[PDB]
Structure formats: structure tokens, C-alpha cells
Amino acid sequence: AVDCALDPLSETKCTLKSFTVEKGIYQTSNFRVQPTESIVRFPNITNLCPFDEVFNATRFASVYAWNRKRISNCVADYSVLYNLAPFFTFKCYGVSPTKLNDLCFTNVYADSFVIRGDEVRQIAPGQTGNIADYNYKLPDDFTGCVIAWNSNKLDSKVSGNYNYLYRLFRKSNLKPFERDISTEIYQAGNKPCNGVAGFNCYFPLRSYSFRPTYGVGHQPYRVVVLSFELLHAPATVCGPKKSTNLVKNKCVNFNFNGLKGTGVLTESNKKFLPFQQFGRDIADTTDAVRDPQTLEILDITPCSFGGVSVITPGTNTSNQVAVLYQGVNCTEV
Amino acid sequence: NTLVKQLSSKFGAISSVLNDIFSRLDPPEAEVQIDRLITGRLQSLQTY
């Protein structure tokens, strides 16, 4: 047996896959410097932002007039979005619905409405049907989450509810995130309908008429869609992570506002100007960052690394080796 | 220079960097993106 981490001769044997090494110079591996500490930097915003009244609301809007709300400059918490109901559907595209407590987003959009029971599958990327092309359309590069839950005990009534409407007739399919509130009559025929009902003149709205008696696949469902935008920005909104003091001139691993890395942070001389947040290099990688608690610029440089070679005669003659470190001045090994 | 510039390709994945892929998706799903990136980079280096 041979231990591949005892001495350079053993490493050479382990690389060559042999118990005898002949005369020559062999390239064994590379040497790096490991991190010692760990820091996390997040913005100092501590207030919360509206999530209770988005879900604990009295009346949601119809499908064709879906309610839109913008969420920014807060601290998001998603633990409270667990006990909505005994059973509910929670599907996220582009993110996993367990890791969105340590991610920083630019702007959050919340769209709320109420849908027929069996049409929940139609709120999805690139799906066709009745509401996905005439009421609510989603893009093909969506990055967000969809939540749906039962609303029989609250919405359906015995006396009769007719306050929820959808649209059935339209010229062309809707652009994503586009709303229509027109009531102009349909023109299937060749003659004008002069704003009166008749054949080929249909009013492009319809009612649900929910009653507590229909089958399990027909009761109303409440649907809310969350849209994110994970890009480069001041990062107005993100969740509950505790900050830590920053260190300099030492190889550590860092998490700057959602950007994870390892390296050495140094005071910067770049000529940033107000709107510039971070910088790049020739190879399209991050080089400079701006600390979101002091508004100062730091430069990132990976800590020392290099290549190691072993010079030995044949194992038949001796077991002595010499080590060559490539491209380094060994006053700074 | 072109070998260096190939590092910004996506190869059908959701991002051109690895840390955000590992910090946004669960282990069951990040494997496809990691495989795509690894295969693309291996092909580029082999061609070189």
C-alpha cells in the first residue's frame, strides 16, 4: 500500500500509478491557500413589507382585472407562507421553494386573482387554453412562484355569487403581462351589431355561479403569482440574514448581497461614479464590489496558487527528491 | 484569447456561473445545469 499524502515521492507514485519511479521530472499537482474566516454582508433594512393583506384579503379581483402589487425596500420572510391552508399547491420555476430565504431580488411583483377549479394547471409557462390566452398570459422565461389554495368555504354561497367574470371571445392572443378591460361587442358577422345583442353579437363576459354543491374539481381556487427579477441592481428587497464585520488582506470566503466567492479583499483605486455598483474584467468576471453598508469599493483577488514539480532519480538508486515551485519568488511561498 | 472568452457561454443552462446555480436550485435539479456547463467547457478545451 501507498499513502498519497505522506511525502512527494508517494504523491508521484500515486499519480503515475506505479510502485517504481524512474529518472526524470514529473508534474504532480497544484498548491493553493485555504480560507480561514467567513463573512456575510447584507443591507441594514430591518422593516417588513406587506404580505399579510395580500393573502388575508377580503375580496380578490376577477381574472380579466387581476390585481397587481409592487413590493420593494423591505425584508422578505417566507416562513409565514406555510400555514395558508391544510393543503395547497406551491410551484416555483427558476428557484427552489426552500432556498429563497437567502437570495436578494431587485423588485417583487404580486398578481392575485381567482380561477375555476380545474384551470389551475393553466397558470404555467407556455400553456394554451381558455384563460392562458384570453385572460392571463405568462412569458416563457418566467422566474417566480405560483400559489393556489381552496376557497369553497369563503367564496361560494348558497344565495348565488355572480361577481366573478372571465373573457371568452377576443381577436388575438394577449401579450404577456398585458391586461384588457374593453367591453366593445364581438363582430363575428359581416354587419355591425349597433351595440345590441343578437346572433354573432355576443357579450364577451361570462359568470361562474359557484354553489357549495358542485364536485371537488369545480369549486373556486385562489391564485397568487410572485414574479422576481434576479439581475444587477441596488437590491432593494431580500430576506433575514445576519451581517458580520468585514476583513481585509486575508483569503476568506464572502457573500456580498447574494454574490458568493472566495479570495482577498483590498482597498480599491478604481474611478467609480455614483450609479456604478460593481465591475468586470476582460474575461467577464467580477473584479470590484461595493459594500452595501459603507459605500466603498473593494477589489477581489484570488489568493496564492501555483504548480509543483518533483525531481528525483530512479527509486532503484535513492529515495531522495527535490521540489520545484513554478513561477513564484520563494521569499513569498 | 478565444479559450478564455469561451467561459461566458451558457450552453443552454440558466446562468454562466456556478455559485448562483448552486445557491438557487435544489440538488435534484442543479445537476442538469452543472452537466451542461461541464460538458461544454470540456469540449472547448479538447478542441484547443
Binding site: 474584467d281 476582460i282 474575461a283 484570488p302 504548480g307 513554478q326 513561477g327 | 484569447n1 479559450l3 478564455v4 467561459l7
Partner: peptide
Amino acid sequence: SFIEDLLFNKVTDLICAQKFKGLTVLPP
């Protein structure tokens, strides 16, 4: 020599960026 000097003069940050990706150049 004179001609060798002329020939040597005739033929002539990116290096650091390449090195930080793992590509190095060995000496003769």
C-alpha cells in the same frame, strides 16, 4: 551581432487575467 540585434528588435494586464483562469506559459 548587429544583424542579430536588429532581428531581435524587429519581432515583438491580459497575462494576469489569463493566469487567473489557469493558463500559464513555460520558459525554454
